Design an enzyme around this catalytic site. Structure first.
Site, PDB file in Angstrom:
ATOM      1  N   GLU A  49       0.839  -1.189   0.000  1.00  0.00           N
ATOM      2  CA  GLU A  49       0.000   0.000   0.000  1.00  0.00           C
ATOM      3  C   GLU A  49       0.887   1.257   0.000  1.00  0.00           C
ATOM      4  O   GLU A  49       0.546   2.252  -0.638  1.00  0.00           O
ATOM      5  CB  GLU A  49      -0.989  -0.021   1.168  1.00  0.00           C
ATOM      6  CG  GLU A  49      -0.642   0.855   2.350  1.00  0.00           C
ATOM      7  CD  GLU A  49      -1.422   0.435   3.568  1.00  0.00           C
ATOM      8  OE1 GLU A  49      -0.998   0.727   4.704  1.00  0.00           O
ATOM      9  OE2 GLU A  49      -2.459  -0.230   3.369  1.00  0.00           O
ATOM     10  N   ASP A 219      -5.504  -4.436  -3.634  1.00  0.00           N
ATOM     11  CA  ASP A 219      -5.801  -3.021  -3.542  1.00  0.00           C
ATOM     12  C   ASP A 219      -4.536  -2.224  -3.869  1.00  0.00           C
ATOM     13  O   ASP A 219      -4.589  -1.252  -4.613  1.00  0.00           O
ATOM     14  CB  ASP A 219      -6.380  -2.635  -2.162  1.00  0.00           C
ATOM     15  CG  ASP A 219      -5.494  -3.042  -1.002  1.00  0.00           C
ATOM     16  OD1 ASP A 219      -4.707  -4.001  -1.155  1.00  0.00           O
ATOM     17  OD2 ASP A 219      -5.599  -2.413   0.073  1.00  0.00           O
TER      18      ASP A 219
END
Ligand SMILES: [Ca+2]
Length: 621
Positions: A49, A219
């Protein structure tokens, strides 16, 4: 311009060596402060991330500047360090038997998990196409967790010394919190841990081989792709596209492999509800969503494993659309763009199916009840045969008891709506922005409060392709807080929605104004030396001392620094180097005093979000 001044101000607070957001190789840390534990368990570890946010910060920088060097640099580092190279992942894979099934179990003490060789696994339908397309057998995606300054001491490929060390922690099911892991190297030579390294804590087999294992956080990749879409639109505006040419290509190749995030753990068919049922033969095992992960194992035999659990917080319509529609971002595989078009719509349906009566988005669904393809309880709501789960994947704490995913995920929808004017995205966002407005606290004194902890009730209606209202699905705000990373991302989502609203319907000034207020009150109150920060009570940090890490009776091993790994050992007992952390006494003092310790953290992603949210106000208004 002004809100871009704001961005510039924080951008080089981030890029000033003094403040120390990056290691000597330019790999950003999870956070400037080292004593932090939440997803990583130490601050100068980093995550997939973090890298994706880095790329995004630079895309926005080069939009405001014309200077795409910083963007190129951030991608350079990311491919070099966070994506396993050829030496990192050497292989002979069998698409018909892509893995051997192992179950998931309710508590860490039920692990290691036994292989079940009779349990049919299904056909991996992406592999042969991907070999054809790229000439390689290498997998192009980020592993999710790195020990950047080799703090744990596993090094590179077992050398106990190199920086940018691939590690992994979470392995033992939905109750294995960040506090209850045994950090281990992704590359396993048996040089630490027990006789079989750490393998036999997690998997029960007759015999164990040296091997490597990697785990992608979808993600993260999707955000990297989402980021690169804007760098492509923005460089092309300025006639500098060709400069960024091969970097859009990286995004598209990544996009192409990211399609492993779209499949049931063991390529089992959606709805099967029985571990003994036959495996899928192709896309009948695709849920077409961004699952909690794909994983690839490999002997020093090969495995590839998607995931059966999906969280709405992991979805990314903007990325999906970009890959599916924008001819510059088109993946090279025959079916790539095409699979992404399906993912785009399935995702949007998913978000709408998860929308509570109030407007908040509930957690997700699974194709594998209890992670063992069990029969769903009577009355269970379903989405394409997948079972609703309020907290998919993790339960300690509940994966959708964190308000943060609302912002992270709806920001991406809000982008997609702005680009596109999709009515479902719009109607989704409408009811969600409405909810956001009703729960955000703007106080009279100029302080603000966003929700922190959510709780849930009931179920959606079973999906049949059209919204119903989900009148039995209920969100409750349990408490409030002042998380700046999220506050900014919430602001960012409100801005893209409001923009799209002006562009495609009745302008929502309320939304823009609520965002501005958040971006303004934040900037006035919580600015500090290294960027921005707000006080934060971490009661849970008692777990440093109190949390027993499960180790099997009779299992004996050592961490690289010599800490002994055995039954009874606590979280801190296998991470002794924490005792030389500058904040250790502060922590010790608070633990004994009996009250929660306090920190003013600078998480890279948080500071990246705050930056991008201010910049997004200027780009849109
Ligand atoms: Ca637990």
């Amino acid at each position: 311009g002004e809100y871009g001044q704001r961005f510039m101000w924080l951008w080089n607070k981030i890029h000033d060596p003094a403040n120390g957001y990056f290691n000597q190789d330019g790999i950003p840390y999870h956070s400037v402060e080292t004593l932090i534990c939440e997803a990583p368990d130490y601050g100068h570890l980093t995550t997939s991330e973090a890298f994706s946010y880095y790329v995004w910060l630079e895309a926005v920088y080069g939009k405001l500047t014309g200077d795409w060097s910083k963007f190129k640099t951030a991608w350079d580092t990311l491919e070099k360090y966070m994506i396993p190279s050829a030496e990192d992942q050497p292989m002979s894979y069998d698409p018909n038997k892509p893995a051997t099934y192992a179950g998931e179990w309710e508590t860490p003490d039920k692990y290691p998990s036994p292989l079940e060789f009779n349990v049919p696994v299904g056909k991996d339908p992406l592999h042969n196409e991907l070999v054809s397309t790229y000439g390689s057998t290498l997998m192009y995606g980020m592993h999710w967790l790195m020990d950047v300054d080799n703090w744990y001491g596993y090094g590179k490929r077992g050398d106990g010394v190199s920086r940018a060390s691939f590690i992994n922690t979470f392995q033992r099911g939905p109750e294995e919190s960040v506090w209850e892991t045994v950090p281990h190297p992704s590359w396993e030579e048996f040089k630490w841990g027990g006789p079989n390294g750490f393998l036999d804590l997690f998997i029960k087999d007759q015999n164990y081989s040296k091997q490597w294992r990697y785990t992608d956080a979808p993600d993260a990749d999707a955000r990297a792709i989402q980021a690169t879409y804007w760098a492509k639109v923005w460089a092309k505006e300025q006639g500098k596209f060709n400069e960024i040419s091969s970097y859009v290509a990286k995004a598209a190749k990544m996009g192409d492999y990211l399609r492993y995030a779209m499949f049931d753990k063991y390529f089992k068919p959606l709805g099967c509800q029985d571990k003994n049922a036959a495996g899928g033969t192709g896309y009948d095992s695709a849920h077409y969503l961004l699952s909690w992960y794909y994983a690839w194992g490999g002997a020093l035999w090969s495995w590839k494993i998607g995931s059966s659990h999906v969280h709405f917080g992991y979805q990314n319509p903007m990325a999906a659309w970009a890959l599916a529609n924008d001819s510059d971002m088109k993946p090279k595989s025959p079916n790539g763009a095409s699979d992404w078009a399906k993912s785009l719509k399935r995702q949007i349906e998913f978000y709408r199916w998860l929308q509570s009566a109030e407007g908040a988005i509930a957690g997700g669904a699974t194709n594998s009840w209890n992670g063992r393809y069990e029969k769903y309880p009577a009355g269970t709501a379903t989405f394409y045969g997948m079972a609703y789960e309020p907290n998919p994947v993790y339960h300690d704490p509940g994966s959708n008891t964190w308000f943060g995913f609302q912002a992270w995920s709806m920001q991406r929808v809000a982008e997609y709506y702005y680009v596109t004017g999709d009515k479902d995205a719009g109607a989704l966002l409408e009811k969600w922005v409405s909810w956001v407005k009703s729960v955000v606290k703007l106080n009279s004194d100029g302080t603000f409060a966003i929700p922190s902890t959510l709780d849930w009730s009931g179920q959606p209606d079973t999906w049949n392709g059209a919204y119903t209202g989900n009148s039995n699905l209920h969100v409750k705000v349990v408490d409030y807080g002042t998380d700046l990373g999220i506050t900014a991302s919430l602001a960012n989502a409100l801005l893209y929605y409001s923009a799209g609203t002006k562009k495609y319907g009745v302008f929502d000034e309320g939304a823009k104004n609520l965002a501005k207020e958040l971006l303004d009150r934040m900037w006035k109150l919580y600015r500090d030396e290294k960027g921005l920060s707000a006080p934060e009570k971490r009661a849970d940090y008692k777990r440093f001392f109190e949390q027993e890490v499960y180790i099997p009776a009779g299992w004996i091993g050592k961490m690289p620094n010599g800490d002994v790994i055995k039954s009874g050992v606590k979280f801190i007992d296998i991470r002794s180097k924490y005792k030389q952390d500058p904040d250790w006494p502060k922590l010790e003092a608070a633990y004994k005093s009996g009250q929660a310790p306090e920190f003013r953290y600078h998480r890279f992603w948080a500071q990246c979000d705050i930056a991008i949210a201010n910049a997004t106000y200027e780009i849109l208004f």
